[PDB]
Amino acid sequence: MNPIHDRTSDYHKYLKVKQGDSDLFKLTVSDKRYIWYNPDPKERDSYECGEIVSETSDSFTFKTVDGQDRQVKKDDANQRNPIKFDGVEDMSELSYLNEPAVFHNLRVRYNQDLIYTYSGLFLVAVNPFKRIPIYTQEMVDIFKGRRRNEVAPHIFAISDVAYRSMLDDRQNQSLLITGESGAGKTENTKKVIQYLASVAGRGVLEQQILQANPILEAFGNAKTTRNNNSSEFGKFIEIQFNSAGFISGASIQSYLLEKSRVVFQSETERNYHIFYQLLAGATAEEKKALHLAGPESFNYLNQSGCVDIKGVSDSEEFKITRQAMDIVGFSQEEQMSIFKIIAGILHLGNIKFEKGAGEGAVLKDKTALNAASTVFGVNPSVLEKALMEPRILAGRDLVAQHLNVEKSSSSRDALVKALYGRLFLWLVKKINNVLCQERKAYFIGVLDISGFRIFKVNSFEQLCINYTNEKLQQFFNHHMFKLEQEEYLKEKINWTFIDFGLDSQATIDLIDGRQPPGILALLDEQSVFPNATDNTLITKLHSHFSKKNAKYEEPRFSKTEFGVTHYAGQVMYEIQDWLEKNKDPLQQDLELCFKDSSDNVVTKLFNDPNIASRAKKGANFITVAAQYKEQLASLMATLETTNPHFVRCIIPNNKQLPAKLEDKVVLDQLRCNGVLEGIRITRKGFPNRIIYADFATDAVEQYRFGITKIFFR
Ligand SMILES: Nc1ncnc2c1ncn2[C@@H]1O[C@H](COP(=O)(O)OP(=O)(O)O)[C@@H](O)[C@H]1O
Ligand SMILES: [Mg+2]
C-alpha cells in the first residue's frame, strides 16, 4: 500500500495534518467571519481573534475576547481565513494574506510538529528544537521523483525539485538555506546532502561526501549562547553530477572562519569542539606525546566557565571525527599532525609573558614554550626570539624589536589564529582533493552562510556577515521580484509594476562601493595610511556618510561607532581594532620559524602559497576586506549561473526550547525574509510560462497571451 495514502504510515503520522473531529467539522461549516486584531495597539505582534458582527461600505465591527465592540476600516482589516485553510501546505492558497494569518497557519502546523510549509515558490522551516522521525531512508524513498504538489512540504521535496529541474532544463541549481543563528540552516543543509547522495548515488564517493561536514564541524563549530552547535564559518557545497544525473563529485568553499574564538570566548560559550574532543578522546599514549591535560589546564579553554555541552559526549564525538577522517582518506600520520597543531595551539596559549629589566618582555617559565615547539617540530629558542624579539626592516636596515608583554601576547595570539585558519583551509583543500576528482557536467550548490546578526557588540566580523546576508537578500529580491516583473513587461502581458518595497542596493553600495568610496574602500585607504588610528578611521567614516547617506547614522551616544540600516534592521558597529583586523599581521620571523618545522602538515601551512601567501597588491598586501569582497563577488557570480531555491529557516524563540512558538520572534523573521511579498508575487503574477511551440494558438482570465509565450496563474 502507498504510504502517501496509507493513514497508518509514518509519512501520514509525521508529515500530514491530523484528521479533524466532528466538533471541528461543525466549526468548519459555520458561515461566521473573524478578524485578527491587536488587543493592545502598543503590541503589534500580539493578536486575538474577534468575530465580525456588522459592516458598513468601508468598515467592519467586531466583538473582542473581552466582549467590547471595535471598528476597523476594511483597508486596515486583517481578516482571518476560513478555518478549512488552517494547516494548508502552501500559504499562497490562503484567501487572506496578512501577517497574523501567515503566523497562525505556521502555528497550527508547528503545534502538530509540521515544521515545513511552502510560501509560494520557497520553503519555510521552523526549528522544532527536538527530533522528528522524518529523515529516514524510508522517507527519502517516498520523496524520490515526486512532484512538489504530490507530497507534503519537506526539505527532501525542494531537493528533488532542484534535482529534476537540473535534468529537465540542463541547468545548474542552488539551494540557499538562510536564517539567524540557531534557526536550523546546518541541519537542513545536511538533509539536502543526505537526500541527493541517496537519489543520485551509484557508493564510496557518496559515503566520503557524507563524511565531509562531520570533519568541518569538529573544527568550525562551537557552543555559543544562541546555538550549542553554532557554525563559525559559512559554506558553499557544490554537489557535482554527470550528464546522466549521477553524483560525480563535490566541492566545498568556506567563508569567514571566526578565528578570534580560538583565543577568547564569552562566559558560558566554548572554543571549537575539536579542542574538547581531543582532550576527552585521546589515548593515554597520545596524551603523553602531545603533553595533554584537562581543559581547565589551558588558558584557551578555562576562561568561559564551560567545558561541556549537555547531551554531548566529546570523546564519542572524537571517535566520529576520527572515523570521518579515515573514510575521507586522511592518513594516520596526517591525523596525528592535525592533533599536534591543536595541542600546540593550547600550549601556545599557556605562554605567560612577563616584564623584564625595563621595557621589553621576558619568558621566565619555558614549559609551555617547549611543549608547543615539540608538537610543532620547531626550534624553541628560534620560537622565543620570533615572539618577543622579531626582526623588521627600518628602510633597508635589519632591526631587532623588543616587544613588551602586551605586544608579545598579541603576536602569540596572531600566530595561534594564523595556525588555526591555515589548518582549516588545509582541511577544506584535503577534503576537495578527494571529492572533486572529475569534471562536473552540472551542479547543485547548497549555501549555508552565517546568519544575519545584531549582537550587543558588532565589529568587523559582524559587518562581513551582515554584508554577505545583504547581498543574498538582494539576490532573493532580484530573482523573486525584479526579474519576474521584467519577464512580464518584455512579453507585453499588460502588467502593472508592483513596488514590493524591498531594495538592498543603497546599503550594499554604502558598504562595498567604489564611487563614491564605501566603508570597505575607506577602511582599506586608512589601512595603508601610516598615521591611521581608530580615531582617524571613525572621523573619515563620519566625514563621508554622516547626514549624507540615509542608510548611515553617526550616533550621539558614542564617538567610536556608526550605524548601518540593513534589510533586517539597524546595526551599530564599533571600529576598535579594525585597522589591525584588516591588515591581519603576522611577524615574518614567526613565518620563518614555522617554515622550518619537522612536521609535514605544519610545513604545508607555511610553504603552500595558496594557504600561506597573501595576494600581491603593490606597495602592501591585499587587505582582509578586499580579499573578502572578491571571494563574495565570485560566490554571487556562481549563484547567478544557477536556478535558485530558497529555504527560510525560522527560529521559534530565543531560548532553544521546543513547543514554544513566539509571536514577536517569528513575526520579526517573516518581515525580514520577505515571506508575505514572496507569496504576493506568486498570487498576483503568472508563475508558469509555456510557449505554443513547447506543448487557434489559444485552442480553448487566469491566463495572458504574450509576444512569445502563454502565461498562467
Ligand atoms: N529539523 C530539525 N530537527 C531537529 N533538530 C533541529 C532541526 N533544525 C535544528 N535543530 C536543532 O537546533 C539546533 C540548531 O540548528 P542549526 O542547524 O545548527 O542552526 P544554524 O545553522 O541555523 O545556526 C540543532 O543543533 C538542533 O538541536
Ligand atoms: Mg549552522
Swiss-Prot record:
It comes from the Eukaryota. It is found in: Cytoplasm, Cell cortex. The modification N6,N6-dimethyllysine is found at K130. Residues 632-654, 704-713 are annotated as: Actin-binding. Phosphorylation inhibits thick filament formation and reduces the actin-activated ATPase activity. ATP binds at G179, E180, S181, G182, A183, G184, K185, T186. Residues 86-713 form the Myosin motor domain. Residues 30-82 form the Myosin N-terminal SH3-like domain. Limited proteolysis of myosin heavy chain produces 1 light meromyosin (LMM) and 1 heavy meromyosin (HMM). HMM can be further cleaved into 2 globular subfragments (S1) and 1 rod-shaped subfragment (S2). Myosin-2 heavy chain is two-headed. It self-assembles into filaments. Hexamer of 2 heavy chain subunits (MHC), 2 alkali light chain subunits (MLC) and 2 regulatory light chain subunits (MLC-2). Associates with elmoA. Myosin is a protein that binds to actin and has ATPase activity that is activated by actin. Dictyostelium myosin-2 has no K(2)EDTA ATPase activity, perhaps correlated with the absence of a Cys at the SH-1 position (688). Belongs to the TRAFAC class myosin-kinesin ATPase superfamily. Myosin family. This is Myosin-2 heavy chain. It comes from Dictyostelium discoideum. The chain holds residues 1 to 747 of 2116 of the full protein.
